[PDB]
């Protein structure tokens, strides 16, 4: 996975002037802290996620079906896990776990990511959610017991 | 050289970046501009032009003073709602030979 | 006479209503030769610099303004001999402007350049 | 710790903090002196 993220546009617009080995340095610090932090964050899309070697017959397998697989296995760490959306907004590298929190995804989640942050104010309770952003209450229904809130 | 107008940085980080003057000290010793900053904070010391976010910088360290959306740091940086309005030095930059773009007006 | 010419050619300022460049510290000391009765910029520096601008273009020494193209184009020919500068950019305050119309003097923009 | 091939090639490691942010990096790059001073750095 630093492989991947030394080798990723990511870690040349997040460190510039380091040398591709000190960005699998920074990965592999972070990983041991929370892999499902790390690989969500650096898998950002079907063609990141594809380059890890799960199976030598990967390569041949329906990347629809494929992709779908992988993502529903993230879907069900991020939601046991929890997301903070506190640190998301402090932080912009958890702002990648929102995208598979169940009744949530990138539409949703960037957009209450940006009112959260241009309101400039952490979540101070789950009912904030409904408050202060635009959500329904299926999607609130869905996503409330998955958000974490320090 | 008045306020409200569109002037060019020349030397030092700043390469050819497109600024806006807000106002102007009657003594005309320092002028205040709106810009973005390319300094790394001192982490990647042993970039491009991004909008500054006042969350992410807290935690490095150093002489930090916040009374809510009002920041100072590191030699008066002086800030407010997130964006920085520190002031800068005429010989820096160059009033003429601008001529701003509608991508200018989106960002300030 | 010479009190009317630059000092020194460090910071140097034109009068907005008459164009006429002098150093900061001759319109302070002196005043403004060709116009007095009308601004009353002599004695303060807050006067001064709400009419009077740094940012000017171009000089012209006006030795006979009496009998000169150039004095003519430039609406200085009924001015005193001096240096005075081609173009200074800026307008005169939303008070002073109103007083001058009030005592029958029409204020006229100095800014004669053309935009891009 | 991250390194390579290592022949002519050094080895960079990067210090963490728990919020994820970095710290300042280290440099690491007959052969007894030099391992010596590296390990002294480390
Ligand atoms: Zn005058």
């Known amino acids: ?73 993230f879907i069900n760490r991020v939601n046991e896990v929890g997301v903070d959306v506190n640190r998301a907004i402090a932080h912009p590298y958890s702002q990648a776990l929102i995208q598979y929190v169940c009744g949530l995804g990138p ?17 101070e309770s789950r009912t904030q959610l409904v408050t202060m952003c635009h959500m329904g209450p299926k999607v609130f229904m869905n996503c409330a017991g998955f958000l974490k809130i320090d | 050289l008045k306020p409200k107008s569109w002037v060019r940085l020349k030397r030092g980080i700043y390469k050819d970046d497109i600024a806006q003057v807000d106002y102007v000290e009657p003594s005309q010793n320092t002028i205040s501009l709106k810009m973005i900053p390319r300094i790394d904070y001192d982490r990647i010391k042993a970039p491009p032009q991004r909008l500054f976010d006042a969350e992410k910088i ?34 820096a930059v160059i009033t003429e030979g601008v001529k701003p773009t509608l991508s200018e007006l989106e960002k300030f | 006479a ?9 910071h140097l300022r ?13 319109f302070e000391y002196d005043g403004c030769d060709n116009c007095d009765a009308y601004l009353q910029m002599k004695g303060n520096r807050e006067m001064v610099y709400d009419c009077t601008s740094s940012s000017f273009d171009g000089i012209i020494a006006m030795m006979s303004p009496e009998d000169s193209w150039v004095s003519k184009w430039q609406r200085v020919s009924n001015f005193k001999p001096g240096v005075y500068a081609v173009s200074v950019t800026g307008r005169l305050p939303q008070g002073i402007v109103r007083e001058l119309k009030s005592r029958g003097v029409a204020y006229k923009s100095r800014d004669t350049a053309i935009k891009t | ?23 300042d990096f280290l440099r690491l790059p007959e052969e007894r002196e030099k391992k010596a001073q590296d390990i002294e750095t480390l």
């Open chain 3, 2 to 10: 010479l009190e009317t010419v630059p000092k020194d050619l460090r």
């Open chain 2, 58 to 91: 807290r935690s490095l360290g150093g002489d930090v003073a916040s009374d809510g959306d009002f920041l100072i740091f590191e030699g008066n940086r002086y800030s407010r709602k997130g964006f920085l309005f520190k002031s800068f030095a005429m010989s």
């Open chain 4, 1 to 23: 710790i991250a390194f390579s091939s290592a022949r002519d090639h050094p080895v960079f490691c990067a210090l963490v903090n728990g919020e994820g942010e970095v710290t």
């Open chain 3, 14 to 26: 034109a009068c907005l209503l008459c164009s006429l460049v002098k150093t900061i510290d001759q």
């Open chain 1, 107 to 123: 539409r949703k989640g960037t957009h209450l990511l940006k009112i959260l942050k241009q309101n400039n104010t952490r979540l």
């Open chain 1, 1 to 73: 996975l630093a492989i991947l993220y030394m080798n990723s546009k990511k870690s040349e617009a997040e460190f510039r002037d380091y040398p591709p080995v000190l960005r699998q340095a920074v990965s592999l610090a972070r990983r041991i802290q929370d892999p499902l932090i790390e690989f969500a964050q650096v898998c950002s899309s079907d063609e990141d996620i594809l380059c890890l070697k799960f199976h030598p017959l990967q390569e041949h397998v329906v990347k629809e079906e494929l992709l779908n697989a992988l993502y529903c296995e």
